[PDB]
Amino acid sequence: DVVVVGSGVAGAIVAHQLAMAGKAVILLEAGPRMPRWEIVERFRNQPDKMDFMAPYPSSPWAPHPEYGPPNDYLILKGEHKFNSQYIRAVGGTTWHWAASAWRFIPNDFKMKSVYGVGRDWPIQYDDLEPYYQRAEEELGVWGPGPEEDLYSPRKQPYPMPPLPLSFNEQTIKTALNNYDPKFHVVTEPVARNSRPYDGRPTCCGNNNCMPICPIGAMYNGIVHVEKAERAGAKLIENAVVYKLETGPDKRIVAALYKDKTGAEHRVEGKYFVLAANGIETPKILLMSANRDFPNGVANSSDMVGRNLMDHPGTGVSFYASEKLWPGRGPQEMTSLIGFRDGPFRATEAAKKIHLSNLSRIDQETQKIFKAGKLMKPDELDAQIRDRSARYVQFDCFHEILPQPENRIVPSKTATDAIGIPRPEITYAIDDYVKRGAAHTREVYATAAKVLGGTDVVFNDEFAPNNHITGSTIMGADARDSVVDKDCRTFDHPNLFISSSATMPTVGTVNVTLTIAALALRMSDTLKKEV
Amino acid sequence: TAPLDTFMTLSESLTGKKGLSRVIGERLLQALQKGSFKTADSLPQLAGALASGSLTPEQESLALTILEAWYLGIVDNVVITYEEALMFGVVSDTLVIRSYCPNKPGFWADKPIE
Ligand SMILES: *Cc1cc2c(cc1C)nc1c(=O)[nH]c(=O)nc-1n2C[C@H](O)[C@H](O)[C@H](O)COP(=O)(O)OP(=O)(O)OC[C@H]1O[C@@H](n2cnc3c(N)ncnc32)[C@H](O)[C@@H]1O
Ligand code: F3S
16 A cells, blocks of 8 residues: 655654554565663763764674764765764654754745745745644644744644743853844753653653653654554564665555565555654665656656765853852753854855753763873862853854755665665755855854853864755646656656655755654545545 | 672772672673783772772773773673663763653753752
């Protein structure tokens, strides 16, 4: 009936919707089923608790990127590393996310028209709103009410209100908004429970959201996998897909997948949804070149794997003069959103900026022992407490504009343990981002000044942020674009792509709520095809 | 007086904490032995120099290494323990150990009391 490929959120929502409307479903997950208690124990037993991939092993047959230390799965060329993370396992990469759950703002959808750069969406905010709201309700998202304007106009209030801000984050909101109300520091919307919700407990302040909440007080992809399964979808773990076959009638006829042995298998149904992620999905597509489609399925555009995007990151850290004590409650409760929009967006990149509320005991204890100076236990404790108390760090997402030379292709040369080719990402970061970043570095310096900042360190190397978007871009017309404004493939009237791959613009904020929205949209549209 | 005995009394002096666990102490010892404490004279010599007089940079640096292990709970990028790592007890009044709830919940709006 429907084969869905990818058991993350993008694809589990879809699977759950349809198997609810009775129409029988098959969900293929490359990775294995690993339960929460195991991820947790793996975390407790990892030596660098700042490595958010570390408690998620790459299966030989369905590997994913690692960097503590490198496993080399991705082939990175170009001028910059696309060292984003993701997880291959039942439930997908939102095992390990922060559950930041934003909406894009209206102008984000009309970037060339309005700002004369990048590239419009076909649909616009209006069209997405009611799906945002449904996504918020399905994920369980809390957020502020009318006392704070998040610049994406709402029909309903948030399903939940925030838990109170930590001292750290409220004090800094108050101080920063008092220096410059332009900054508009606000409480951040997040897929996390301020009360018992859809059967999940309220948030307790494990301060471990990356890389696992132990109790599921925040949303994880697994929630809708389990939903889909009770609603009668068939989960097949360790089924890693490497080809879709195109049938005579131009549609999609089957998906081919290797198990953990390298042995090959074949799955048929009526409709096909790729919700692999923004890398593995292009990869499957081009692995699938064949007689009638010499350029790889859905790629009459030449745009598949292309347009690849993520939020080039940039940071500051210092010791504040006031005590603040990061590490209490969630790792992020707040954001500084006053530069998501502006005329400047024609010249240079917009950002969201966010203060970290991560515990820094380890970090700052480690630091002190590096100074190579024996202390009386009392000095040592005094200092651990003080340093851990006063550390502050800001990071940020910059927008990067969709660019066709930024792309992922399946390696001609390199391969994995079961004989599937490997992602080869070319990627560069141009002056649009870099001029945005120069302004950010000034906000940072000002934040430091305001907060009595000491030992200020600027982090000017662009970090990844795991927001993998572009690679099957969304279009009006089917040749500079892969999917219509419904995430139907232009080339295959029975293939949809549920992923941030589809998003032509990456905007200023975490992309996953938008995905959840598109997923529900798609699932409506598909519910109509008997 | 075996190596453990000396280790344990050493660590007490260095950490200032009474009632350090010998079960964990054993494990830290054995991991530290992989590639520290060249001799068998090191531990005793460290105790005497510490207890009374004063330390070579090298001796200082051994003491640090011992301290490092108790406070971080890790030795050569292996976790010996997580809960009982001492840095957490130094801030247990205010900060949680990541992945462990406070026994009563949403506490964190307060400014901590010094
Ligand atoms: C790493 C990370 C990511 C992250 C984050 C923090 C961290 C540390 N914080 C986020 C946040 O605050 N807000 C947000 O919106 N996103 C955040 N992210 C990224 C987020 O996890 C992703 O955007 C999200 O997971 C995307 O959802 P999607 O379902 O599209 O992708 P996925 O969760 O990676 O799931 C993909 C599944 O498909 C399977 N797969 C892949 N290839 C294949 C093949 N060939 N065959 C079969 N299955 C396949 C994967 O196994 C995976 O389960
Ligand atoms: S990991 Fe879990 S309970 Fe609260 S702050 Fe983070 S969600």
